[PDB]
Amino acid sequence: HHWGYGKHNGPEHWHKDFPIAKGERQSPVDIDTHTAKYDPSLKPLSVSYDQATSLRILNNGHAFNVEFDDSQDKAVLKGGPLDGTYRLIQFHFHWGSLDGQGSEHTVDKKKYAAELHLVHWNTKYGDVGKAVQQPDGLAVLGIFLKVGSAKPGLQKVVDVLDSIKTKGKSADFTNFDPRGLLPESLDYWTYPGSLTTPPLLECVTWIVLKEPISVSSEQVLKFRKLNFNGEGEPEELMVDNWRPAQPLKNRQIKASFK
């Protein structure tokens, strides 16, 4: 009775209620490193997350989101392929049932254990709702997660998951600094795309970082214990909440490095 990632309502069925699923600028895509164009005019990214205000964490079925106060320019993204200022509103992850899968975007067909999406909207449009009606309304910063050593800054997240085990649950999540989730380098690939979950609006500028961050098997293991289901319904573990790569079509993937 609604979309999901299961056999009967997963990615292959989405086109029936969301026609745009077969559009020209659908995400995610596979990043072929030998075909991306090095664009020396691309500006360096400017991540200003020093006044970031996290407020809440919630399991909305699909995944879990950490929400941010976006009433003012407190956490912004600018630079890169962007024009104007973009406010951070929320972040979430996509992960798999095994370490060899989980990411949405792939690099040379290589899948990672998980992928972080830091969602921003264009301030020019006044509100999030208006921004999703424009070709350049959103900007999502994608980061790959590979299994290795633990990431200190991710632990705060891992510890609270127990309280939002089922759909609809939320918990206060203040004073979280998102700068703990960035890799050392800000080198990236960029391309025009869409949201990777319904309604699949083609209103996003994707910025995927080259350097993945590493997380322990223990940290990823805790992601896998969440539930798609709400309290009292049959248990359905939250894993493989990822959409398979889509055809690139009339698009060019640019690289900010050589």
Ligand X SMILES: NS(=O)(=O)c1ccc(C(=O)NCc2ccc(F)c(F)c2F)cc1
CA angle, 135 then 41 then 127, to 5°: 30
User: Residue 34, annotated ligand binder?
Assistant: no
Residues in the chain: 258
**Token pair belonging to 56:** 């809440």
Start-to-end CA span in the chain (Å): 47
Per partner kind, with CB cut-offs from 5 to 8 A, the member of Hg ion, ligand X, Zn ion, none near residue 141 is none
Question: Of the candidates 87, 105, 111, 117, which one interacts with Zn ion according to CB under 5 A?
Answer: 117
User: Residue 105, annotated ligand binder?
Assistant: no
Contacts with 111 (C-beta within 8 Å, 6 or more apart), sequence order:
96, 100, 101, 102, 103
Per partner kind, with CB cut-offs from 5 to 8 A, the member of Zn ion, ligand X, Hg ion, none near residue 70 is ligand X
Shortest distance, CB of residue 26 to Hg ion, whole angstroms? 13
Question: Of the candidates 30, 39, 69, 236, which one interacts with ligand X according to CB under 6 A?
Answer: 69
User: Residue 94, annotated ligand binder?
Assistant: yes
Residue 62 designated active-site: yes
Binding segment for ligand X among 1-9, 117-125, 152-160, 213-221 (CB under 6 A)? 117-125
User: Residue 1, annotated ligand binder?
Assistant: no
Q: Is 187 in a helix, a strand, or coil? A: coil
Amino acid (one-letter) located at 176: F
Which residues are near Hg ion by CB under 5 A? 133-134, 203
Instruction: For residue 143, state whether it binds ligand X (rule: CB under 6 A).
Output: no
Spatial separation of the C-alpha atoms in residues 143 and 210, rounded to whole Å: 8
Amino acid (one-letter) located at 183: P
What residue has token string 């055809």?
247
H-state helical runs in the chain: 128-131, 155-160, 217-223
Nearer to Zn ion, 25 or 117 (CB): 117
Nearer to ligand X, 38 or 107 (CB): 107
> Among residues 114, 115, 118, which one has the least CA distance to residue 54?
118
Nearer to ligand X, 199 or 216 (CB): 199
Q: Which residue ranges make up the site for ligand X (CB under 6 A)?
A: 55, 65, 67-70, 89-90, 117, 119, 121, 128, 132, 138, 140, 195-197, 199, 201
Active site residues: 62
